[PDB]
PDB file of C-alpha atoms and ligand atoms in Angstrom:
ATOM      1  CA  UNK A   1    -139.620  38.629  -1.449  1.00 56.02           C
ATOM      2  CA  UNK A   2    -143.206  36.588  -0.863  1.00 54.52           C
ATOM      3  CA  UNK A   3    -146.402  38.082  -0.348  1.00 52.77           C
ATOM      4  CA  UNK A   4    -146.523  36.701   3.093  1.00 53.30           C
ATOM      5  CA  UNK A   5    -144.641  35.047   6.269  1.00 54.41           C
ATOM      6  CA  UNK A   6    -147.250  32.532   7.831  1.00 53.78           C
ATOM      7  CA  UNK A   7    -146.459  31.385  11.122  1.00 54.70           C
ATOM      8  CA  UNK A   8    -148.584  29.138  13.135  1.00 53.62           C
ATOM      9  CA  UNK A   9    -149.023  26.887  16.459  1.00 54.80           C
ATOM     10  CA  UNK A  10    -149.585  23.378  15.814  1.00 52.03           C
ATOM     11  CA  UNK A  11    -151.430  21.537  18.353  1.00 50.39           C
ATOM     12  CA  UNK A  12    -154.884  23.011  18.575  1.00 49.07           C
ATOM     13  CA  UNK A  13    -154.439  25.423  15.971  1.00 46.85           C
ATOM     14  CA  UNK A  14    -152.862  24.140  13.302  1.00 44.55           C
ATOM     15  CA  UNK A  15    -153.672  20.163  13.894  1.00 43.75           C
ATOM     16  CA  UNK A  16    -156.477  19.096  15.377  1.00 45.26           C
ATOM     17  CA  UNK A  17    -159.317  19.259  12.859  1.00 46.13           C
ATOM     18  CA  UNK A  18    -157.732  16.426  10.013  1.00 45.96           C
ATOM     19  CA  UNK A  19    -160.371  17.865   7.379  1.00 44.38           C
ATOM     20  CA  UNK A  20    -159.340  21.849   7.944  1.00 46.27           C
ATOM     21  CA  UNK A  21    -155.402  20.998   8.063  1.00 44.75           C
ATOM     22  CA  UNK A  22    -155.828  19.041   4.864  1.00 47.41           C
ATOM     23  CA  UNK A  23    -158.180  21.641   2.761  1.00 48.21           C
ATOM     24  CA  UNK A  24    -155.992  24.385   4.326  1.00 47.12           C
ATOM     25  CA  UNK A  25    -153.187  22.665   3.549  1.00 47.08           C
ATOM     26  CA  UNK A  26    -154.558  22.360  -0.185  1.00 44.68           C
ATOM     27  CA  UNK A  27    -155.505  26.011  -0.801  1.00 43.51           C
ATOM     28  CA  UNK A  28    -151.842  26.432   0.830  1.00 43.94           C
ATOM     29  CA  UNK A  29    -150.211  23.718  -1.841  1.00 46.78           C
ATOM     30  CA  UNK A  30    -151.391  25.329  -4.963  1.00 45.53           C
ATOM     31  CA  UNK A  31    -149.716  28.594  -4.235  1.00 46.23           C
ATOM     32  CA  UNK A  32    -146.029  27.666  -2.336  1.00 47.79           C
ATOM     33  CA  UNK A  33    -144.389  30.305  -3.489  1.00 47.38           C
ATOM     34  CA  UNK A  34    -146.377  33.056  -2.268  1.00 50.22           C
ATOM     35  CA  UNK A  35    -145.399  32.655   1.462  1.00 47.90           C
ATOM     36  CA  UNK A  36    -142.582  31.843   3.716  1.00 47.51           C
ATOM     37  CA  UNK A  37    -144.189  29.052   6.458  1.00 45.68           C
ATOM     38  CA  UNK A  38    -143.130  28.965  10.179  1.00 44.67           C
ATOM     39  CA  UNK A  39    -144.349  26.691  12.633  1.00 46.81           C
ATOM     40  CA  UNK A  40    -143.800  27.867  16.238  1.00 45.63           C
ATOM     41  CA  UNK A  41    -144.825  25.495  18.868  1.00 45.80           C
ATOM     42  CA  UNK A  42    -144.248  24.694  22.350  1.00 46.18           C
ATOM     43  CA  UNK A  43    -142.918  21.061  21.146  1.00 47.73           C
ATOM     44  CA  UNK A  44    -139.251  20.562  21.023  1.00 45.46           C
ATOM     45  CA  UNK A  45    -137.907  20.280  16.961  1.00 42.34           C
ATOM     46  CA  UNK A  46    -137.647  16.531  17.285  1.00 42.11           C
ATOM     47  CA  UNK A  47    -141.507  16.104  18.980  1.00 43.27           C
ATOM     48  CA  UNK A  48    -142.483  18.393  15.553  1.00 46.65           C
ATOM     49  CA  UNK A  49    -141.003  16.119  13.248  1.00 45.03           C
ATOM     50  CA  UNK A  50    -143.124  13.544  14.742  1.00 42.44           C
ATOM     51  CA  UNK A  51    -145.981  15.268  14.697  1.00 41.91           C
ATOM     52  CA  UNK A  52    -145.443  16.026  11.027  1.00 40.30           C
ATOM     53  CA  UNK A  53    -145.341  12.343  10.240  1.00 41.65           C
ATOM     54  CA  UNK A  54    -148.351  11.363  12.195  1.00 41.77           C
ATOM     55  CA  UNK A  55    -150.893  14.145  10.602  1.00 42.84           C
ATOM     56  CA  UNK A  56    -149.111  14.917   7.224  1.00 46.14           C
ATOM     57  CA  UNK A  57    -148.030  18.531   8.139  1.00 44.73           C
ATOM     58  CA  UNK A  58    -146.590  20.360   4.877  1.00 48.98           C
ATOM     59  CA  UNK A  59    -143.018  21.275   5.105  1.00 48.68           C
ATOM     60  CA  UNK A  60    -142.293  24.838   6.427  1.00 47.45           C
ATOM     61  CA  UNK A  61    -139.214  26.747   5.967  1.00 52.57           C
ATOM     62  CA  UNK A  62    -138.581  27.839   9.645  1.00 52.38           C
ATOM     63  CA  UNK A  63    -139.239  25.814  12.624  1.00 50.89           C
ATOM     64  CA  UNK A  64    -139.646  28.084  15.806  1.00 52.37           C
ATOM     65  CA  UNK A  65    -139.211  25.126  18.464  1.00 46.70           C
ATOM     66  CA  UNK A  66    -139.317  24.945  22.173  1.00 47.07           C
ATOM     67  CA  UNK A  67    -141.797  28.312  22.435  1.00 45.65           C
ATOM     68  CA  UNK A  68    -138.990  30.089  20.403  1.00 47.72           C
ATOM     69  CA  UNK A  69    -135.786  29.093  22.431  1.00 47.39           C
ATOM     70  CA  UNK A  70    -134.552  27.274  18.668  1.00 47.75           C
ATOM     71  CA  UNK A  71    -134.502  28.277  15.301  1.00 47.46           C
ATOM     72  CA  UNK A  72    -134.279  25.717  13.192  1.00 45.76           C
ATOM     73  CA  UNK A  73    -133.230  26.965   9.312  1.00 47.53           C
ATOM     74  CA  UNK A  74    -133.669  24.130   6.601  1.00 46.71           C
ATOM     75  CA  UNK A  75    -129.781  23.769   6.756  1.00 44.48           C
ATOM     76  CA  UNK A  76    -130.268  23.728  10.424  1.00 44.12           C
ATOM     77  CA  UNK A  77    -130.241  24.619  13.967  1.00 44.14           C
ATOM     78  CA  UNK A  78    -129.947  28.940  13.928  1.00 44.78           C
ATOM     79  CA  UNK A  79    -126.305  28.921  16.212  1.00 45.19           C
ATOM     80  CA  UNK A  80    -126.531  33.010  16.393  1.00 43.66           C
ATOM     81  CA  UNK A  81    -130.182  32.724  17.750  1.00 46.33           C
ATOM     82  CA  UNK A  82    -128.457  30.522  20.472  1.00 45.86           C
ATOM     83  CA  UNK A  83    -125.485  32.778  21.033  1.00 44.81           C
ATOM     84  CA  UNK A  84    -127.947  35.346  21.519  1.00 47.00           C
ATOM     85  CA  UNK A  85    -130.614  33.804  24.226  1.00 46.35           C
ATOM     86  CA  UNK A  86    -127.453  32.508  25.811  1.00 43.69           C
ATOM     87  CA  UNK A  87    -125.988  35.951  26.584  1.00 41.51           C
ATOM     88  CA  UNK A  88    -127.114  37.212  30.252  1.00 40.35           C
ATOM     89  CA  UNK A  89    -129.181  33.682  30.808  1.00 37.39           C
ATOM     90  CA  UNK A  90    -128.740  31.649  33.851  1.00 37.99           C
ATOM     91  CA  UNK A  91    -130.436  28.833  33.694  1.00 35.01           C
ATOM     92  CA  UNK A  92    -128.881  27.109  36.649  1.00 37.84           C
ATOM     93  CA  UNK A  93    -129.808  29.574  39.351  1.00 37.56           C
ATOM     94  CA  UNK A  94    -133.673  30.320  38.114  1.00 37.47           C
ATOM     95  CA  UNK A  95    -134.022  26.345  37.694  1.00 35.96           C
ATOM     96  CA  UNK A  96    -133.268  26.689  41.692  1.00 37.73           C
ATOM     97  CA  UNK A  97    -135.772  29.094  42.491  1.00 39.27           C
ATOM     98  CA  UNK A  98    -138.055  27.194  40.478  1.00 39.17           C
ATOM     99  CA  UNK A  99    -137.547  23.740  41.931  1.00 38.24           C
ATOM    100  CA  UNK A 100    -138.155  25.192  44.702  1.00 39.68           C
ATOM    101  CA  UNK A 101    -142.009  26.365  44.768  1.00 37.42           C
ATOM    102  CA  UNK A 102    -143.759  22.587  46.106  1.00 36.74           C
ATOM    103  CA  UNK A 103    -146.689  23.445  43.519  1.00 35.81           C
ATOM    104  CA  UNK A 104    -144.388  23.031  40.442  1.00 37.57           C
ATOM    105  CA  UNK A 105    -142.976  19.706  39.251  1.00 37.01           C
ATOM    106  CA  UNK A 106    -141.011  19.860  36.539  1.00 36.02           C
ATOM    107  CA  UNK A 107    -141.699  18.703  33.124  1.00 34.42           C
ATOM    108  CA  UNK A 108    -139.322  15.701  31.842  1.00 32.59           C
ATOM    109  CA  UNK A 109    -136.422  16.305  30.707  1.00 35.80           C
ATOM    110  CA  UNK A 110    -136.904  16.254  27.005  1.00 37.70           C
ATOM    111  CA  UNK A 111    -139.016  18.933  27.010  1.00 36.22           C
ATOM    112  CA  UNK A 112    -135.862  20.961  28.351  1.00 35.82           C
ATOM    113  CA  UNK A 113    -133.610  23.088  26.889  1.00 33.59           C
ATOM    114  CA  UNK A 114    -130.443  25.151  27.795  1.00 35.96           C
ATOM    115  CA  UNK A 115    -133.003  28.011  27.079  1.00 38.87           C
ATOM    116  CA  UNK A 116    -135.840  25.989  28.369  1.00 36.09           C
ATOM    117  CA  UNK A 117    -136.894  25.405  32.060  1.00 35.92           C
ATOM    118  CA  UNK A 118    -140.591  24.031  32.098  1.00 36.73           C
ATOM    119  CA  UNK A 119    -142.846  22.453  35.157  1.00 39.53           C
ATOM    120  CA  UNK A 120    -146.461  21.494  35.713  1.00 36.34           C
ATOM    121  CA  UNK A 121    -148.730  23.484  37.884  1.00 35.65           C
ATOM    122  CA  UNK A 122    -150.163  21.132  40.729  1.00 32.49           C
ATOM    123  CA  UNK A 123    -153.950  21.438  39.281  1.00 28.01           C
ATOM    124  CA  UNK A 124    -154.969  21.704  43.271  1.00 27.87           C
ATOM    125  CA  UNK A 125    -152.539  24.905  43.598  1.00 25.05           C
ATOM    126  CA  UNK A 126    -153.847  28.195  43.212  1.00 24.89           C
ATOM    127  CA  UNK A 127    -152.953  29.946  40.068  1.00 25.25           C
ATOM    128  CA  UNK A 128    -151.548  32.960  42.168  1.00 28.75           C
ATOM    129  CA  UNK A 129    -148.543  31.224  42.712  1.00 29.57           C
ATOM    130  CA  UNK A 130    -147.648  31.501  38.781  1.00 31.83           C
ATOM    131  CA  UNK A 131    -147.379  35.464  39.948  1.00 31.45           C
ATOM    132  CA  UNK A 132    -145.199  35.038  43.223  1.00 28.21           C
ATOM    133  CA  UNK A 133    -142.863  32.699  40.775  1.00 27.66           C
ATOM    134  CA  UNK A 134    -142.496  35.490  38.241  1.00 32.14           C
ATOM    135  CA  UNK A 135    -142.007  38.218  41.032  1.00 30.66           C
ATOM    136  CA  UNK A 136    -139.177  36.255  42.476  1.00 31.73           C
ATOM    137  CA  UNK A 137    -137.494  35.403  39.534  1.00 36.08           C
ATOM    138  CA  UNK A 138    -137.409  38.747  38.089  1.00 34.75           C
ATOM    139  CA  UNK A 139    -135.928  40.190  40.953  1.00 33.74           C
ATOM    140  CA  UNK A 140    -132.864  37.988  40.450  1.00 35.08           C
ATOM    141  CA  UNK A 141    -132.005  40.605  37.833  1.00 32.60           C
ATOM    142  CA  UNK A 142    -131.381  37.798  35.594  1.00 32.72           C
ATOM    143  CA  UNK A 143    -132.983  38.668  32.146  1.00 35.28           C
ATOM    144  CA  UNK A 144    -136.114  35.733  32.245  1.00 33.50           C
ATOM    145  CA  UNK A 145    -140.161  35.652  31.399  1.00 30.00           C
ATOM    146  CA  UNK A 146    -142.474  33.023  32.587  1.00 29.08           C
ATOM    147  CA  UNK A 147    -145.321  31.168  30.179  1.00 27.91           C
ATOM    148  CA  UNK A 148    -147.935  29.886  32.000  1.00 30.53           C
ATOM    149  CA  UNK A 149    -150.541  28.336  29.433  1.00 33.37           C
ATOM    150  CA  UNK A 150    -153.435  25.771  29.143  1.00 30.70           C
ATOM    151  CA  UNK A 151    -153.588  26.392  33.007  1.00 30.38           C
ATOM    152  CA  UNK A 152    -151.085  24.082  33.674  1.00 28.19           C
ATOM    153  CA  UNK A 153    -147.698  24.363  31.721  1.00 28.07           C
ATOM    154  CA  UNK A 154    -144.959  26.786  33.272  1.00 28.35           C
ATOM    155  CA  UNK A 155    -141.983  27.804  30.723  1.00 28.34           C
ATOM    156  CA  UNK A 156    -139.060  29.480  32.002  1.00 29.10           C
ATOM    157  CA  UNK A 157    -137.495  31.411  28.829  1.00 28.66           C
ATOM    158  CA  UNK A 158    -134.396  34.374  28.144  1.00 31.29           C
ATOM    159  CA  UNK A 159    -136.512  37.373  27.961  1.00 32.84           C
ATOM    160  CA  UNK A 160    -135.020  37.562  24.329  1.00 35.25           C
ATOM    161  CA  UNK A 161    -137.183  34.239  23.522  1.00 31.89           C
ATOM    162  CA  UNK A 162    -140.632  33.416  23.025  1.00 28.79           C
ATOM    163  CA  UNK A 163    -142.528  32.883  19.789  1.00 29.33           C
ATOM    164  CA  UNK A 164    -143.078  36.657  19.255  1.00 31.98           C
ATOM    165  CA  UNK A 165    -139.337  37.401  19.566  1.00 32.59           C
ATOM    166  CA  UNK A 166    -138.481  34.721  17.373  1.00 34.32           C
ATOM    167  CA  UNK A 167    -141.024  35.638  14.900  1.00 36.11           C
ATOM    168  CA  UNK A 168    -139.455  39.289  14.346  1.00 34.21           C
ATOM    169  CA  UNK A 169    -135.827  37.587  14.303  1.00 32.21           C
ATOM    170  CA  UNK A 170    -137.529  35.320  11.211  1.00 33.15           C
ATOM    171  CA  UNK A 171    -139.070  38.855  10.365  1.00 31.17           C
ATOM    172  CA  UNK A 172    -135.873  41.395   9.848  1.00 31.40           C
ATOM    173  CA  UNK A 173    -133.732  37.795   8.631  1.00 31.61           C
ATOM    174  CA  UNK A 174    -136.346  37.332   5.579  1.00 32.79           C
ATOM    175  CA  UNK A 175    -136.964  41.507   5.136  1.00 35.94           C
ATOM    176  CA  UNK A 176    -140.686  40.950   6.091  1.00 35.23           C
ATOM    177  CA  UNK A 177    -142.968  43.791   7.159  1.00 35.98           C
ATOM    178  CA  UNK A 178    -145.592  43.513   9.637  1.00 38.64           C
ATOM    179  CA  UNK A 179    -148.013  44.190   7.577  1.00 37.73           C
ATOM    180  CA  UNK A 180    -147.146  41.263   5.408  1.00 33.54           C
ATOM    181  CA  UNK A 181    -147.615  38.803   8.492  1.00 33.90           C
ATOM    182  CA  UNK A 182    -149.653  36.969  10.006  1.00 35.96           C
ATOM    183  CA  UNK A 183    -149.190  34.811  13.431  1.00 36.54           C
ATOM    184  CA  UNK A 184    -151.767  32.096  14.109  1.00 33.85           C
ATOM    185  CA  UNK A 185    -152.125  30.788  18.358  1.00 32.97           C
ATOM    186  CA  UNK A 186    -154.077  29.189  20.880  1.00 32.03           C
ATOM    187  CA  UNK A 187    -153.018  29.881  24.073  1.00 34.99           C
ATOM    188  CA  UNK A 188    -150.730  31.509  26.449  1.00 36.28           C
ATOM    189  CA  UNK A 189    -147.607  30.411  24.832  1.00 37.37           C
ATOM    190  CA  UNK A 190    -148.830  32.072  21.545  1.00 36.80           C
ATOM    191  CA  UNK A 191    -149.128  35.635  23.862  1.00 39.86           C
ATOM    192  CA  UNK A 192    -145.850  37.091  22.006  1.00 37.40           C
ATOM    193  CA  UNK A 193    -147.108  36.716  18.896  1.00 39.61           C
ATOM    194  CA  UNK A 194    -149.700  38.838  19.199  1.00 41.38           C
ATOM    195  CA  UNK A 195    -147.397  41.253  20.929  1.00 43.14           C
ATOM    196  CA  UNK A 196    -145.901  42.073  17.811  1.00 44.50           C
ATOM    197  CA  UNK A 197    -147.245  44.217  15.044  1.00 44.00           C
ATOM    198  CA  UNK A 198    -148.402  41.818  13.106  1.00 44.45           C
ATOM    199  CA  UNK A 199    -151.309  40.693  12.117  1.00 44.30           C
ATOM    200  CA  UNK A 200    -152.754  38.000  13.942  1.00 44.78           C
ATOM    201  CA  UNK A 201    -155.792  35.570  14.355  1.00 42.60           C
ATOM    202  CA  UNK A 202    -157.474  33.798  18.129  1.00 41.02           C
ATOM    203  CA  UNK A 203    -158.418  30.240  16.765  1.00 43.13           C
ATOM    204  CA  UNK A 204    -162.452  30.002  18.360  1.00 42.79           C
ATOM    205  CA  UNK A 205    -160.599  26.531  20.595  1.00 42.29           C
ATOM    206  CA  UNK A 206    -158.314  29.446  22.516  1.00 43.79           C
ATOM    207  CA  UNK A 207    -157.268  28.841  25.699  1.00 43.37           C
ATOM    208  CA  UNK A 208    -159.117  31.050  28.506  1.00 45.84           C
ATOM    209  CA  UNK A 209    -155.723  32.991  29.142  1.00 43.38           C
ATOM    210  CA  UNK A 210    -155.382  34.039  25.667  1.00 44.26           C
ATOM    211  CA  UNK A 211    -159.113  35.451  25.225  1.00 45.34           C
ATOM    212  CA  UNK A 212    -158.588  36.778  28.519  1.00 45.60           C
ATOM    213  CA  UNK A 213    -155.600  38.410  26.897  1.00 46.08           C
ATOM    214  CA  UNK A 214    -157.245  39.504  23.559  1.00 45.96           C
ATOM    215  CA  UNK A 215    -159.911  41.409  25.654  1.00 45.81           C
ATOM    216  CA  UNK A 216    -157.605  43.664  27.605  1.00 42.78           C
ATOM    217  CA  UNK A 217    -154.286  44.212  24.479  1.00 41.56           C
ATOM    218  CA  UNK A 218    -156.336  43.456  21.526  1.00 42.83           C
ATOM    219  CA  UNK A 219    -156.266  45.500  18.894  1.00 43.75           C
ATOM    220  CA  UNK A 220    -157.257  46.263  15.151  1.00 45.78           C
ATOM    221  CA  UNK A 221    -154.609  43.756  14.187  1.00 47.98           C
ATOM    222  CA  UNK A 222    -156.162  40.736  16.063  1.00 47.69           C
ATOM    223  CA  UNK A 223    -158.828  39.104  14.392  1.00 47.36           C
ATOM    224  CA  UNK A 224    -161.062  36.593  16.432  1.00 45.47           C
ATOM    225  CA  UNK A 225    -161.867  33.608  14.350  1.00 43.13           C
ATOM    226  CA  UNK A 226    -165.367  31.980  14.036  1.00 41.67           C
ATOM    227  CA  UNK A 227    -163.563  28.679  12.667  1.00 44.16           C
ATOM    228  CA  UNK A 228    -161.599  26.627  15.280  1.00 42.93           C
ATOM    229  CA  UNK A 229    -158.420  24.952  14.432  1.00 45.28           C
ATOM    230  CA  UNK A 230    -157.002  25.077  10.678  1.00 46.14           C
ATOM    231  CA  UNK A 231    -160.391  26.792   9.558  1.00 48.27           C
ATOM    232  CA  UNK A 232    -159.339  29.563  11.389  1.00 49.56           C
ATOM    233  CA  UNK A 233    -156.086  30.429   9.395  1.00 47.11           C
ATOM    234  CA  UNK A 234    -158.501  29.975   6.114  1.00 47.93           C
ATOM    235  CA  UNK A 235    -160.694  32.797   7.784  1.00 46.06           C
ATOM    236  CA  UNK A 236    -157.861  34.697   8.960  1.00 44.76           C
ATOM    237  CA  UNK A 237    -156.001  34.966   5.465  1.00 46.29           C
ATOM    238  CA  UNK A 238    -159.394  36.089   3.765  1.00 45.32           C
ATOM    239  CA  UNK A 239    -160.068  38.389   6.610  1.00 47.23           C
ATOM    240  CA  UNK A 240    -156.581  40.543   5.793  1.00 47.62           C
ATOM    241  CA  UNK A 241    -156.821  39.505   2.280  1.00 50.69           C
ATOM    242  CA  UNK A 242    -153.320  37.867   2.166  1.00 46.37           C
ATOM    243  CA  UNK A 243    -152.637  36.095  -1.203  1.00 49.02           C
ATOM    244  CA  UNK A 244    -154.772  38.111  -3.037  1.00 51.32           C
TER     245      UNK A 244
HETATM  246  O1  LIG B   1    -149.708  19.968  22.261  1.00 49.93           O
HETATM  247  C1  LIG B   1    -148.496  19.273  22.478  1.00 49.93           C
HETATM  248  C2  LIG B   1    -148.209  19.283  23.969  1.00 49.93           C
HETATM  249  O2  LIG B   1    -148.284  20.643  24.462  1.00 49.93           O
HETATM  250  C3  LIG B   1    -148.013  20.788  25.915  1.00 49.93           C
HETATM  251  O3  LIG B   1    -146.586  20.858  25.911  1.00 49.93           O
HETATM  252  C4  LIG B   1    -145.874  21.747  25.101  1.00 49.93           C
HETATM  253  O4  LIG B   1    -146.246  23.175  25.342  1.00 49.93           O
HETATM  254  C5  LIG B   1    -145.978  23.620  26.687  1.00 49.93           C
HETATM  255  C6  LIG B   1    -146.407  25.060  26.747  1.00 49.93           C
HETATM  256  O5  LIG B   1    -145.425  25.843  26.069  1.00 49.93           O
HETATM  257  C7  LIG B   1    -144.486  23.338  27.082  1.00 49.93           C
HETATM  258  O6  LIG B   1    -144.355  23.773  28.387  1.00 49.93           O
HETATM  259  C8  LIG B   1    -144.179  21.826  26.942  1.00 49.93           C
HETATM  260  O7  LIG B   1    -142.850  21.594  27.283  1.00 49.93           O
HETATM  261  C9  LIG B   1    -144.381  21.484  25.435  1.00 49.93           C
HETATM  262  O8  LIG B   1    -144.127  20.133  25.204  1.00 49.93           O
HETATM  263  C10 LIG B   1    -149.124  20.044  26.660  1.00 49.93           C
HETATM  264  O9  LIG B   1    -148.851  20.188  27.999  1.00 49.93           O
HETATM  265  C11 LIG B   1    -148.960  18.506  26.275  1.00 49.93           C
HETATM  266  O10 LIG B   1    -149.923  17.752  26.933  1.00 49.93           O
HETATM  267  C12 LIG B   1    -149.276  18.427  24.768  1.00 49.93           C
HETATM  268  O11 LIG B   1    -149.181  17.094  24.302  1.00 49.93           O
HETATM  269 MG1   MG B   2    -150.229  27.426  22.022  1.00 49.78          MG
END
């Protein structure tokens, strides 16, 4: 029933740039009631709230945690989201195959998740091996996709997950078109966001795999900011002439 569904990463896109959160945060604050806000980030729910305190975030009303694998609704944690990624997943046996590449190390252990299995890509290791990890855990038949962002961070998610999954969930559960959307990223783990319809802007700080990205899917939809950080959601919105 809003004009629009906003839905943003934080680090790097969002944060970042204290002057552009807080004037984009202003222009935001004097019309609340035009937009639903989501935040979907690669940090678990309780590393958001922290971030929230330290640079002043506004209050959104949908946290898309973990890269998507939690739903957070303001009366809490999103139990048929879980029910869902859970059905088919097996995290034990692709946390195996994983463990088992000597390039990967895994990430500690609060940045897992039962929906969750991340690592570290040895910056020595050739990148190649992010492709032989995905060929052999597909083949498992076990319903997964791999993130690989910033070069270095390796997400093992339910093919169900990720942020652009999550976002259409958050989409059909608030009767949202498309149209009246608009997903905000920086790098790799942002990739499903633009995979949906909606509209969506390339802060100018990307990541290399997400302009790499851009220039082989993007489309009409995708808007590549001038404005880095916060400034680019600013641009963005008058670009598509949300909140009109
Ligand atoms: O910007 C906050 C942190 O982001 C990284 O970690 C998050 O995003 C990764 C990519 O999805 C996940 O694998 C990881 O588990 C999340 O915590 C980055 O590597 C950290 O250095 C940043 O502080
Ligand atoms: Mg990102």
């Amino acid at each position: 029933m809003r004009q629009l569904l906003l839905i943003s990463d934080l680090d790097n896109t969002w944060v970042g740039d204290q002057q552009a959160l807080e004037h984009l945060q202003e222009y935001l604050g004097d019309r609340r009631g035009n937009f639903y806000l989501a935040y979907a980030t690669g940090r678990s729910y309780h590393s958001a709230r922290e971030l929230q305190k330290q640079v002043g975030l506004m209050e959104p009303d949908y946290w898309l945690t973990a890269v998507g694998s939690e739903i957070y609704h303001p009366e809490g944690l999103d139990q048929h989201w879980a029910d869902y990624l859970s059905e088919h997943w097996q995290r034990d046996i692709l946390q195996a195959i994983a463990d088992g590449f000597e390039a990967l190390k895994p990430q500690s252990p609060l940045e897992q998740n039962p929906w969750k299995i991340s690592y570290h890509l040895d910056p020595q290791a050739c990148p190649t091996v992010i492709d032989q990890l995905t060929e052999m855990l597909k083949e498992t038949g076990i319903p997964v996709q791999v993130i690989f962002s910033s070069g270095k961070d390796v997400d093992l998610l339910p093919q169900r997950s990720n942020k652009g999954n999550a976002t259409q969930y958050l989409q059909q559960h608030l009767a949202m078109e498309p149209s009246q959307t608009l997903v905000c990223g920086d790098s790799g783990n942002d990739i499903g966001l633009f995979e949906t319809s909606a509209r969506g802007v390339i802060v100018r700080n990307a990541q290399p795999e997400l302009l790499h990205w851009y220039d082989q899917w993007g489309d009409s939809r995708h808007y590549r900011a001038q404005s880095s950080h916060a400034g680019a959601i600013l641009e963005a919105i008058a670009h598509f002439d949300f909140l009109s």
